[PDB]
Design a protein around this ligand. Structure first.
Ligand SMILES: NC(=O)c1ccc[n+]([C@@H]2O[C@H](COP(=O)([O-])OP(=O)(O)OC[C@H]3O[C@@H](n4cnc5c(N)ncnc54)[C@H](OP(=O)(O)O)[C@@H]3O)[C@@H](O)[C@H]2O)c1
Ligand SMILES: NC(=O)c1ccc[n+]([C@@H]2O[C@H](COP(=O)([O-])OP(=O)(O)OC[C@H]3O[C@@H](n4cnc5c(N)ncnc54)[C@H](OP(=O)(O)O)[C@@H]3O)[C@@H](O)[C@H]2O)c1
Ligand SMILES: CCc1nc(N)nc(N)c1OCCCOc1cccc(-c2c(N)nc(N)nc2CC)c1
Ligand SMILES: CCc1nc(N)nc(N)c1OCCCOc1cccc(-c2c(N)nc(N)nc2CC)c1
Ligand SMILES: O=c1ccn([C@H]2C[C@H](O)[C@@H](COP(=O)(O)O)O2)c(=O)[nH]1
Ligand SMILES: O=c1ccn([C@H]2C[C@H](O)[C@@H](COP(=O)(O)O)O2)c(=O)[nH]1
Lengths: 543, 527
């Protein structure tokens, strides 16, 4: 039918935006949305000054060319208008041109185009095209051999290319930190543009960042392809009549590379392919067996962004573990209620623990970490130098025998299981040290995907940081192994909502760096920075 | 001519009735007494039918183009070509093959017998350059296969390996290793009490694509000093769907991206941290086929675990030497086990499985009713409470580690029961990919079958979680050889079905059936 200019000439935009220093009274319960990342410039320069990784990405996108795709674009552009090395075109406003240092101008291996009224060709020494209107560019592009055209900057330039409907896609970097800005990327209208791809999350220059792609919405061997269909002759409701169109946003994305998809894909897999089972009572799960997720802790802190999580509780839990404590009153006195239901009279009685005091959780994690194999008595007992201090041992092995394949911390004490309020969900941690870097595998026997797993990921990632620091190492991977992986029936609706949210780039965890012993951390040694998240979800929508 | 008309072959072959050596020619049995040697195979039937009745519509516009430039010039469906003996071997209820354009080579019967007949081999060429066909499949006859392959005329062979032995009288001709090579290997399946897989022999010589490259902007351009050349077969394969590739891809991954580490006296390893393999025990027994493996020792070791034994002499007296090195005077002394009798392995697997938490004394003590019999407990859990998420058998007793000759490599098993089916995860802290892991897979697959059978369940998946996964430096050469071998269809395992208590298995209760493998490899090539 009819062909758009943005389509024929392959006009794209590429930008990087940070969060903006807009002061608000109560930065607890701050609303986040796509408009959160909108800061483009300050006093003529970049708000964050310099980001090596955003630069590298920018260079990669704007200089990438595929010579074999060219003749199809050539014919196409020629058809539209009736009619060595290939380069991309970069287009920028004069102000952006002048902010670039001389040593870097014109941009290497690219056709440089500058928009100006105040300056003409005679005002530039360099190999650049000077145009004075957007129409001039379109004329120029009909006359050039070039691969793609990128609009690289000036909010004035971005606004008018978007105003004029000349952008096919936006390559948009989300710099996950706050800086003083005076210039802003225009608000992308969600009826005009949808996010189709989200990259991995990275760290560079002391910020996390990721890269997203917005697309303009709907206004000598090939003989091997068929073999694929043959080898697939035995496949198959998928199994479960959850619905397709419920996950419209989830399924519309092409590249789902943000590490949060490791968790969100498992939900989807379980929902679509899970086995229907029933716990003791009449709950109510879909289940599967055996998954692995991996999170790169040197690049980000994997606190889920598709809903709001608070960490104070799980940090206090972790510190309680490290102290060796089994006293549930300690947590309740800090208003942490994680262990409360498992400490009641009724709960303990139903475990046949008739001689256990309320909130005495028995020889659980803390006790096993510090005193494995000692004879549990009560929560107030002084177990000094009894049983195996496996926490101190693993710290010693990591410091003194880093290549050991025996650095395991294990909570599953078979002799003690029946004395515990409940057997541990998190069975063991194994460590691995290469080149001054520490990775952790945690094996989980039982995994409530909806409510527990988001916190568990956070817990063990924090613990890996803690162990790395006191051992003088850098954290590398946290690797989460899931045994029995299940989604409660009563969570499904809430998880559907969640699956259709686009993740934000992850936050970062900072530890007070003065802490040199595992026993020395307190709650104020922990900071989650730049947590950007979708709204709080109640997993059970009961009322 | 082969690329020209888009001609293919499709066949199924089995092994022939009569150490012994295996190769591609092992699978050659085509027919017996004028029928299929195995009589009927439903999966192979389903595959043949899916291959010879499939068309994608928008693909014949490119071939009215391409083909009709060689001889020089209602619904779209495929062509199937056979011989007279093949045709009259098919029951008439099915003839002619539905949705397919049949063709028969014959000297004696003619045209007046919408079915087609041809006089000579080259009478196909001419008859094809007349018709409306998507793709063309030579579908049978030893003789028909034979003289077609001699005259070099097939684009791809679609070849079913029926992994069992039957009486034969006609054979597929030995495919010449230079004319055709395997490019693709399916999943392994069970159907009609045999395993089988599907291989493809090939004749020897949208805005989002750039978005992919952009998302890969920060990757390295491949860490390690093994070579590209050396894995030619491995890199030449398109579809690597045989479950043996779970293992082979891990070796490749470690070889190419492994971290260089050196442990004890500087042996040298390549290592990575955290993999998962999964094997469908209902479809096959995952005994590696790219080298020769033996099981008597690992089965004995398992039986010894189940009895709760920690006595190393019991295994040595049966010439199972797996634990020998860990039971010497010098090994024990270096562990500081100065007060431990030679070959007294301490409170290892068997002791933990049957007596977790008891006080270990020596390998000869009577421990009846001391400690937690986890093994009995997990069995009772599977029977009484299959949906429990606590069905774990754990050997890592933290209290006992120093007393053990060594800490266990296999930390735990966890079990999962759905719809009368049993799955097992085993977590392994330390994995010798070259020598240990192939036995480890086999061991825990056997254990899974045993536990399932005594519980009246069918085995489903064995799931192997690898922690510290490593390849010794001096296995590398051997593993390069191994990666270039194409897997055979897996064998099957049969247990004596009478045994319904975990403690009542003996060595003669276990039979590996239809094990087809490449030759033994010395992992260390050292002499
Ligand atoms: N973070 C990012 O992705 C990114 C990218 C680029 C720039 N920046 C930052 O953004 C700021 C620059 O943006 P900005 O909005 O101030 O300026 P800009 O868009 O770079 O430049 C505006 C100027 O370009 C010329 N111009 C623009 N549109 C034109 C048209 N249609 N016809 C003729 N001339 C035209 C005019 O030049 P004359 O005044 O000479 O007529 C105009 O004054 C700086 O802070 C820079 O650091 C950020
Ligand atoms: N994939 C499989 O497993 C598969 C598939 C199909 C069949 N089979 C089995 O294979 C067996 C049949 O194989 P087979 O080779 O013995 O018989 P065949 O190949 O089916 O038939 C051979 C006959 O085809 C005709 N023919 C062959 N070459 C010719 C030429 N150049 N010109 C003219 N006519 C020619 C001759 O028939 P006349 O001279 O009598 O006209 C010849 O006797 C059966 O046992 C069947 O069950 C197996
Ligand atoms: C190339 C810009 C530059 N280069 C060196 N070598 N030094 C500087 N100080 C510098 O900044 C001058 C501030 C003017 O801002 C621009 C100018 C052009 C492009 C982008 C730009 C973009 N359009 N999309 C993404 N994703 N990321 C970036 C930043 C790399 C920003
Ligand atoms: C339709 C064949 C048939 N069907 C029923 N139900 N009973 C029979 N006795 C029977 O004939 C048995 C005699 C010979 O069969 C043929 C005839 C042509 C092709 C193949 C054939 C093939 N080329 N490649 C594969 N991979 N697998 C098969 C077996 C399905 C077998
Ligand atoms: O940190 C935790 C604590 C609990 N659970 C969930 C998993 C199970 O749903 C339940 C434990 O019950 P069993 O699986 O042990 O029955 O608690 C988690 O996922 N993470
Ligand atoms: O069943 C086994 C037993 C041992 N190993 C290997 C892995 C290691 O190379 C070594 C174990 O000793 P440490 O990792 O604890 O040194 O033995 C296996 O792969 N499988």
């Amino acid at each position: 039918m009819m062909e758009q200019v943005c389509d024929v000439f392959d006009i794209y935009a590429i930008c990087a935006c940070c969060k903006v220093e807009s002061k608000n009274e109560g930065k607890k319960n701050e609303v986040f949305n796509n408009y959160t990342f909108r800061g483009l410039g300050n006093k003529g320069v970049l708000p964050w000054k310099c980001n090596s990784l955003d630069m590298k990405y920018f260079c990669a996108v704007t200089t990438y060319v595929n010579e074999s795709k060219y003749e199809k674009l050539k014919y196409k552009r020629c058809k539209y208008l009736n009619k060595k090395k290939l380069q991309n075109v970069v287009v920028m406003g004069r102000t952006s041109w002048e902010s670039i240092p001389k040593k870097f101008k014109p941009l290497s291996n690219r056709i440089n185009v500058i928009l100006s009224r105040t300056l003409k060709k005679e005002d530039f020494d360099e190999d650049v095209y000077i145009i004075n209107k957007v129409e001039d560019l379109i004329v120029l592009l009909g006359k050039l051999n070039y691969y793609k055209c990128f609009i690289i900057g000036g909010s004035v330039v971005y606004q008018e290319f978007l105003e004029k409907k000349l952008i096919k896609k936006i390559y948009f970097t989300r710099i996950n930190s706050t800086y003083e800005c005076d210039v802003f990327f225009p608000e992308i209208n969600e009826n005009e543009y949808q996010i189709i791809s989200v990259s991995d999350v990275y760290t560079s220059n002391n910020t996390t960042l990721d890269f997203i792609i917005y697309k303009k919405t709907n206004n000598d061997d090939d003989e091997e392809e068929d073999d694929f269909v043959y080898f697939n002759f035995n496949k198959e409701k998928n199994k479960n009549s959850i619905h397709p169109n419920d996950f419209q946003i989830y399924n519309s994305l092409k590249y789902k590379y943000h590490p949060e998809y490791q968790y969100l894909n498992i939900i989807y897999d379980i929902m679509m392919n899970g086995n229907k089972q029933s716990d003791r009572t009449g709950v109510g799960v879909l289940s599967k067996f055996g998954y692995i997720m991996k999170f790169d802790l040197s690049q980000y802190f994997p606190l889920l962004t598709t809903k709001k999580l608070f960490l104070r509780g799980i940090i206090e839990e972790l510190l309680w573990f490290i102290r060796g404590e089994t006293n549930g009153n300690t947590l309740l006195n800090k208003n942490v209620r994680i262990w409360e239901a498992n400490g009641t009279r009724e709960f303990l009685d139903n475990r046949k623990l008739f001689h256990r005091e309320v909130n005495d959780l028995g020889p659980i994690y803390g006790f096993q970490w510090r005193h494995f194999g000692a004879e549990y008595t009560n929560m107030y007992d002084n177990y000094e130098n009894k049983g195996v201090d496996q926490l101190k041992n693993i710290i010693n092995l990591i410091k003194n025998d880093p290549t050991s394949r025996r650095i395991l911390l294990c909570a599953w004490n078979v002799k003690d299981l029946d004395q515990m309020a409940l057997p541990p969900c998190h069975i063991l941690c194994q460590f691995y040290v290469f080149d001054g870097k520490l990775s952790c595998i945690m094996y989980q026997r039982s995994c409530d995907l909806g409510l527990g797993v988001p916190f568990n990921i956070a817990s063990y990632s924090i613990f890996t940081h803690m162990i790395a620091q006191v051992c003088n190492l850098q954290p590398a991977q946290f690797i989460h192994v899931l045994g029995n992986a299940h989604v409660y029936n009563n969570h499904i609706d809430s998880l559907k909502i969640q699956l259709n949210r686009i993740p934000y780039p992850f936050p970062t965890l900072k530890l007070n760096p003065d802490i040199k012993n595992i026993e020395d951390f307190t709650i104020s040694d922990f900071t989650i920075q730049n947590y950007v998240h979708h709204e709080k979800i109640s997993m059970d929508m009961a009322a």
